[PDB]
Design a protein around this ligand. Structure first.
Ligand SMILES: [Mg+2]
Ligand SMILES: [Mg+2]
Ligand SMILES: [Mg+2]
Ligand SMILES: [Mg+2]
Ligand SMILES: [Mg+2]
Ligand SMILES: [Mg+2]
Ligand SMILES: [Mg+2]
Ligand SMILES: [Mg+2]
Ligand SMILES: [Mg+2]
Ligand SMILES: [Mg+2]
Ligand SMILES: [Mg+2]
Ligand SMILES: [Mg+2]
Ligand SMILES: [Mg+2]
Ligand SMILES: [Mg+2]
Ligand SMILES: [Mg+2]
Ligand SMILES: [Mg+2]
Ligand SMILES: [Mg+2]
Ligand SMILES: [Mg+2]
Ligand SMILES: [Mg+2]
Ligand SMILES: [Mg+2]
Ligand SMILES: [Mg+2]
Ligand SMILES: [Mg+2]
Ligand SMILES: [Mg+2]
Ligand SMILES: [Mg+2]
Ligand SMILES: [Mg+2]
Ligand SMILES: [Mg+2]
Ligand SMILES: [Mg+2]
Ligand SMILES: [Mg+2]
Ligand SMILES: [Mg+2]
Ligand SMILES: [Mg+2]
Ligand SMILES: [Mg+2]
Ligand SMILES: [Mg+2]
Ligand SMILES: [Mg+2]
Ligand SMILES: [Mg+2]
Ligand SMILES: [Mg+2]
Ligand SMILES: [Mg+2]
Ligand SMILES: [Mg+2]
Ligand SMILES: [Mg+2]
Ligand SMILES: [Mg+2]
Ligand SMILES: [Mg+2]
Ligand SMILES: [Mg+2]
Ligand SMILES: [Mg+2]
Ligand SMILES: [Mg+2]
Ligand SMILES: [Mg+2]
Ligand SMILES: [Mg+2]
Ligand SMILES: [Mg+2]
Ligand SMILES: [Mg+2]
Ligand SMILES: [Mg+2]
Ligand SMILES: [Mg+2]
Lengths: 46, 271
RNA sequence: AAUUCCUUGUCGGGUAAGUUCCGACCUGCACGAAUGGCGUAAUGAUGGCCAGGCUGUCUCCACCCGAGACUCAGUGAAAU
RNA sequence: GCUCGCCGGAAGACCAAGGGUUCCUGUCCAACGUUAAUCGGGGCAGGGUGAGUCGACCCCUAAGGCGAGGCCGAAAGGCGUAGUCGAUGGGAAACAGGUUAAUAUUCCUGUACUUGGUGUUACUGCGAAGGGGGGACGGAGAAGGCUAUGUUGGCCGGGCGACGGUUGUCCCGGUUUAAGCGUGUAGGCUGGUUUUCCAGGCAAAUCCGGAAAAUCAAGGCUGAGGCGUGAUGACGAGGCACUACGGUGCUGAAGCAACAAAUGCCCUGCUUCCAGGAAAAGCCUCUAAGCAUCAGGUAACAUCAAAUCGUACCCCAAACCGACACAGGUGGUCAGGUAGAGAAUACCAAGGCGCUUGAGAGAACUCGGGUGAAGGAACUAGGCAAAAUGGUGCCGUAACUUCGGGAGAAGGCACGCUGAUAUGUAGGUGAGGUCCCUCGCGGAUGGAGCUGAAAUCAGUCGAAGAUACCAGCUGGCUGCAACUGUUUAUUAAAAACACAGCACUGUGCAAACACGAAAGUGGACGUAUACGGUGUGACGCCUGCCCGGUGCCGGAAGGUUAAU
RNA sequence: AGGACCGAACCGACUAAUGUUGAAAAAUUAGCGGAUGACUUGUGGCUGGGGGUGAAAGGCCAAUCAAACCGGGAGAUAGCU
RNA sequence: UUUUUU
RNA sequence: GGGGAUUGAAAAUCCCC
RNA sequence: GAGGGCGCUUACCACUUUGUGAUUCAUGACUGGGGUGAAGUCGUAACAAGGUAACCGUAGGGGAACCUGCGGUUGGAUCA
């Protein structure tokens, strides 16, 4: 049956993308957090 | 003219159309158009702010001259169209100076007729005129509220405001609603009864008509569950409530009317 | 009676026999006018009831055609 | 490699989204693969995607998003102006063939098109973030024209039968060709041109609009397809050669017509209806500030340019979302033959496949089927499930009825093949010839050839001719609900929600109501024949009494009563 | 002409059997409703947690919804086992 | 307002 | 209900229980 | 042999059968009214100016006769 993950890179970037993260006090705070944890992939790219 | 529909099928059996031949057929006068775009009844925060609004045919807007200036320049109403954004009908007018405009559509309307607005202006059905210069007793179209603004009273299929007395520099009007209200007298106002009036008599006949008119269904409070609307619940039907608005706001005679800032102008409230 | 406890109410009809059905009464435990009343052609994967056709639904099973079950080889679980 | 079988509006083939090297070749098999594996969408190498014209970038805007200044707001920030982004929509251009192990509208052959820069040569008022036009728009329905496509014959090459017959009314196949360029048709729309004048188009205009006359009847847009050309070629059965038996060279026949024919196209049309149907740019033109030998503008020819990114492969799936090589899920495009009403269905074509454990046996039992003596609802909570009906044409069809309906009620008769009327009819298509002509993609007259139901009569085979697949069971009483609809994704589809209709009630516009401590914004670019609230819930006949209590409206004289 | 009739596609989900350490964390098979409309569907946009959205079932809001998920207060508290 | 049968 | 008035006599009606 | 009979076959058609309708008689729980019945109950509408003149048509209401509404008639009494 129709599962819940219908991929789409346009939305993907739009909703959780780097610039969208960066476009708000709180998004920015997310990157801070992950950079601080030393994550290897802040956001998801190419 | 209104028509019954034969019952060749339920959801037609109760239909009653209101077909007007003397209307234009096909596209309207392009340059007097502009976008519209529905809303959903939803805010600029995206929240539904008026319920029951959504869907319905596409709808392009006609400009429609409400202020009615062009003083001195007559015009000759080329035709009568259908506007989708109002119960009122429409009149493509054309001025001697070679300028076209949309005007409401008095009870005489008719293409061929001559129109004119301004202090001069002969009192004739469909003409505009500051009320200072309009026999007390006359019946009058779309009425301005502040001289100059645009006209706002009696814009609807069949409406009309009778002037009742003009003592002072103010006029006193008998609105359609029945309230009596003073107005600046230097306020413009068109002659006659607003067009159509057969409107009242339509029937729709089936849910769809309303759907394709922009009206979603209304669900009764009492159908819901308490958590939803102040009514609702009880094992089967029930009520025992004190008829209120889904926001606990009391109903059935509460007026809500609250100005003070425009009290003066109300001479006698509707009954 | 989507309302009726007593209740399978009583008479009528239907059946060889009918706590359901339909028709009546009305003694309405505890119907009733937009908490709408009472009708209503048509519509309904809607509830109840009857009749024709039809049949393994059944008296009462039987035979047959295939996929497993069974033996061989390879792989190889689970609940407890 | 020879058979057999399955899908064939897919189980084929293309694109997107998504994946992301899975593509090709080698080579290896531990592990991955429900077995083995030598094989793999596994391991390891190596190879592989070539664009002015396909796509994106790009110009242009939608919903909506961001937003200098700005308004708001304890802080954070919220909202918005100019603007600036945003495609799912608008905007210049390439076709056919051939080739690789794997890329091609990208390479090669052939043959085109687009718009810019520079030049030269003639001809000339050109010029805006602006004005006007255009772009630029719904649904339903109805034919006409046509193509894609197919059938038959003609044509060409090949054939003369494993078993009686088969040199003819016999068998098999092939019978294909693009854009572009030329013509401008079927057919759709609209009268043309000239001069004068103006309170409109934020400025102006030679544009549009409006008004005056004058003067011609034929004038201009638009347009499938056909015909020609492109093609002197490409393609093409089959040959003849080499073969490292995979294939590589060279060669090449006919290459037409009649009929049928779309859900494609003319048709962004037409007729008609109401619920009345994006924006902006490109584009045509108008002028403004401007340049007035210039510069720009038009045209033909020559030349330069057309970047960058994408381009393998899987695609209704073993490569995507489903933990798996999972019977699930997944948007668009194509649409052959016989029979059909058909995109149903059954058999086939092209193409793709037999579902990655097999071999035997031929118990109970379970699953999925087939037939069934007599009986025929006895079954069971209930006819659940089975069984039965099942096309078309014609005759025929009750109560009730809101006069549509109920009806497909019910119930009957006919249904194959052959012959005849008629070696193939009514119909359809329509070529010669003849003439006419404002001259041809013309008209008329012509009926050859092609194609073709339906009926009746007569005959005939079987048990049976809507002979399979497909394909309503029908009827009588009654509850509820008017009706189509909506619903508890996943135990409830209904008598629940909804609903057209009715009623009460609020709201006079800076509305009531709602979102928001605001600004802002929905209501609404609406304005009481409108908008909210609540209740009822088609239609028919109707809707009684009660205002004590509770809620609500109106009312102040007095009594009581807050801050102060 | 029609929320018209029959019926594929397509949208739904009325009955039954199988499945129920399934092929499947809701399907398959046979029948079933709708099927020019209150139809269906691609892409993109908006609405956010006592908030949305809801032809209202307390339904739906990433396999859960009588108040989502993630992190923190946090070793909540637990006269209970 | 009523005033039994013949 | 009883009593009287009033009726031709009832009922109604008035006065005394 | 000709002819004929039997047989077989075709037509017409009596029984008979299916479907669905028309009509008519009897019949029916229950139910509406009508008619009849020496002295029941309740009121007393009409007949007289019947104590609100009556009646007809018609619509709502009411234990009942009847009441009320609207037009018409006089087949109405009083010097109104
Ligand atoms: Mg409503
Ligand atoms: Mg409920
Ligand atoms: Mg309950
Ligand atoms: Mg109740
Ligand atoms: Mg029985
Ligand atoms: Mg009963
Ligand atoms: Mg009432
Ligand atoms: Mg009730
Ligand atoms: Mg009801
Ligand atoms: Mg339904
Ligand atoms: Mg292995
Ligand atoms: Mg491979
Ligand atoms: Mg590999
Ligand atoms: Mg700022
Ligand atoms: Mg903003
Ligand atoms: Mg842009
Ligand atoms: Mg796009
Ligand atoms: Mg390939
Ligand atoms: Mg040049
Ligand atoms: Mg423009
Ligand atoms: Mg053709
Ligand atoms: Mg032979
Ligand atoms: Mg042939
Ligand atoms: Mg490719
Ligand atoms: Mg497999
Ligand atoms: Mg699969
Ligand atoms: Mg099929
Ligand atoms: Mg049997
Ligand atoms: Mg039984
Ligand atoms: Mg039994
Ligand atoms: Mg059944
Ligand atoms: Mg069956
Ligand atoms: Mg019942
Ligand atoms: Mg219903
Ligand atoms: Mg469910
Ligand atoms: Mg269900
Ligand atoms: Mg309303
Ligand atoms: Mg209701
Ligand atoms: Mg329909
Ligand atoms: Mg199914
Ligand atoms: Mg259907
Ligand atoms: Mg969930
Ligand atoms: Mg938590
Ligand atoms: Mg703590
Ligand atoms: Mg703890
Ligand atoms: Mg009788
Ligand atoms: Mg009397
Ligand atoms: Mg009287
Ligand atoms: Mg009277």
């Amino acid at each position: 049956m129709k599962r819940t993950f219908q991929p789409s890179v346009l939305k993907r970037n739009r909703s959780h993308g780097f610039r969208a993260r960066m476009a708000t006090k709180n998004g920015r705070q997310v990157l801070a957090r992950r950079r601080a944890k030393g994550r290897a992939r802040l956001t998801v790219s190419k | 003219a209104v028509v019954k529909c034969k019952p060749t099928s339920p959801g037609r059996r109760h239909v009653v159309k209101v077909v007007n031949p003397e209307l234009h057929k096909g596209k309207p006068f392009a340059p007097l158009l502009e976008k519209n775009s529905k809303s959903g009844g939803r805010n600029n925060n995206g929240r539904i702010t008026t319920r029951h609004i959504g869907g319905g045919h596409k709808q392009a807007y006609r400009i429609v001259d409400f202020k009615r200036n062009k003083d001195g320049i007559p015009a000759v109403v080329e035709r009568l169209e259908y506007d989708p954004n109002r119960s009122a009908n429409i009149a493509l007018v054309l001025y001697k100076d070679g300028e076209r405009r949309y005007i409401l559509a008095p009870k005489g309307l008719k293409a061929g007729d001559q129109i004119q607005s301004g202090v001069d202006a002969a009192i004739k059905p469909g003409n505009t005129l500051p009320m200072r210069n309009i026999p007390v007793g006359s019946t009058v179209h779309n009425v301005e509220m502040k001289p100059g603004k645009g006209g706002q009273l009696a814009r609807s299929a069949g409406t009309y405001v009778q002037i009742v007395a003009r003592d002072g520099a103010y006029v006193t009007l008998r609105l359609r609603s029945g309230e009596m209200r003073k107005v600046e007298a230097d306020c413009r106002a068109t002659l006659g009864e607003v067009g159509n009036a057969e409107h009242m008599l339509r029937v729709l006949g089936k849910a769809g008509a309303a759907r394709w008119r922009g009206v979603r269904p209304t669900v009764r409070g009492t159908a819901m569950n308490p958590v939803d609307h102040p009514h609702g619940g009880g094992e089967g039907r029930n009520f025992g409530k004190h008829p209120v608005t889904p926001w606990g706001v009391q109903t059935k005679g509460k007026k809500t009317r609250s100005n003070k800032r425009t009290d003066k102008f109300i001479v006698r409230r509707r009954s």
